[PDB]
A paper describes a structure:
To create a further red-shifted monomeric RFP, we investigated whether the AYC motif could red shift the emission wavelength of the far-red emitting RFP mPlum. mPlum is a member of the mFruit family of monomeric RFPs derived from DsRed and differs from mCherry by 13 mutations (excluding N- and C-terminal tags). Its fluorescence emission wavelength (λem) of 649 nm is the longest of the mFruits and is red-shifted 38 nm compared to that of mCherry (λem = 611 nm). Ile65 and Glu16 appear to be major contributors to mPlum’s long emission wavelength as replacement of either residue results in an up to 40 nm hypsochromic shift. These residues interact through an H-bond between the side chain of Glu16 and the acylimine carbonyl oxygen atom of Ile65, and this interaction gives rise to a dynamic Stokes shift that is responsible for the far-red emission wavelength of 649 nm. Chromophore maturation in mPlum results in a mixture of protein molecules containing either the red chromophore (λ = 588 nm) or the green chromophore (peaks at 391 nm and 506 nm).
To assess whether removal of the H-bonding interaction between Glu16 and the chromophore would result in improved maturation to the red chromophore in mPlum, we prepared the point mutant mPlum-E16P and measured its absorption spectrum. This single amino acid change resulted in an RFP that matures almost exclusively to the red chromophore. mPlum-E16P emits red fluorescence at 630 nm, which is almost 20 nm blue-shifted relative to mPlum. Notably, the quantum yield of mPlum-E16P is 40% higher than the quantum yield of mPlum and its extinction coefficient of 29,350±2,000 M–1 cm–1 is similar to that of mPlum (22,000 M–1 cm–1), resulting in a brighter RFP. Conversely, the structure of mPlum-E16P presents no appreciable omit map electron density for the green chromophore when contoured at 3σ. Only density corresponding to a planar sp2-hybridized C-alpha carbon at residue 66, indicating the red chromophore, is apparent. On the acylimine side of the chromophore, the Pro16 residue in mPlum-E16P appears to slightly distort the secondary structure of the first β-strand in the protein, but does not cause any major structural changes. In mPlum-E16P, the Lys70 side chain adopts a conformation similar to that found in the fast and efficient maturing RFP mCherry. In contrast, the side-chain amino groups of Lys70 in mPlum-E16P and mPlum are able to sit about 4 Å and 5 Å away, respectively, from the nearest red chromophore heavy atom (O2, the imidazolinone oxygen). On the other hand, if formation of the blue species is faster than the dehydration step, the final ratio of red/green chromophores should increase. This is what we observe for our mPlum variant with the most efficient red chromophore maturation, mPlum-E16P, whose 410 nm peak maximum is reached 1.8 h before its green chromophore maturation half-time.
Author numbering: 7 to 65, 69 to 222
Write the structure that this text describes.
């Protein structure tokens, strides 16, 4: 049911510092190669008064290259799919939580994402839009409590040349108890490849590949 080429349709809504928004789009990729692109648009609440970069990672784990000897739990979960929940704790007190449903419907993945951000400083780089994309990350993946967990520190580049850090924890839960893997690592790099001035129209690319740790 997962072909070498698969499209996906994300819908994301929520709020950051009280600012509500909705976003839609369409993407495509090669799940076994760990590669994908997407076209996103802000359909409600645009232009966003905060950095697009905090939303970009809440937008696809069926697209991670896995070696044969590591069970690809999240691909295996299809077609029913899986859900995931995330917390990002930013270094200046900003927090984002996320809940997400992923399913496979009529040959395309469907993503429903709910995002809540709060406690970002008004003069911080998120609310002032001083960010410039994520450095590559490595997510530590491990089974726990009958779910698949991921842990990573993520690094946002700043316009001034510094960095702005987040500690991130995600739980990924298949809708059926397909095979959990052992502990491993996933290397991920997300790039913003195009955007309009005020980021109401955005394109992104991500590559992700699991490996033994
Ligand atoms: Na390692």
């Amino acid at each position: 049911v997962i072909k070498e080429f698969m499209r996906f349709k994300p819908h994301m809504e929520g709020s950051v510092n009280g600012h509500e928004f909705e976003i839609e789009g369409e993407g495509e990729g090669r799940p076994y190669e760990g590669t994908q692109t997407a076209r996103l648009k802000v359909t409600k609440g645009g232009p966003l008064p905060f950095a697009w970069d905090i939303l970009s990672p809440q937008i696809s784990k069926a697209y991670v290259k896995h070696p044969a000897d590591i069970p690809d739990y999240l691909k295996l979960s299809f077609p029913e799919g899986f859900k995931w929940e995330r917390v990002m704790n930013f270094e200046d007190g900003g927090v984002v939580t996320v809940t997400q449903d992923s399913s496979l419907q009529d040959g395309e993945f469907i993503y429903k994402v709910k995002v809540r951000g709060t406690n970002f400083p008004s003069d911080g780089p998120v609310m002032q839009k001083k960010t410039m994309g994520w450095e590559a990350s490595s997510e530590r993946m491990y089974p726990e409590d009958g779910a698949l967990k991921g842990e990573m520190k993520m690094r946002l580049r700043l316009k001034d040349g510094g960095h702005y850090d987040a500690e991130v924890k995600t739980t990924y839960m298949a809708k059926k108890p397909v095979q959990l893997p052992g502990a491993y690592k996933t290397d991920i790099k997300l790039d913003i490849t195009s955007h309009n001035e005020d980021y109401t129209i955005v394109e992104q690319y991500e590559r992700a590949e699991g490996r033994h740790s």
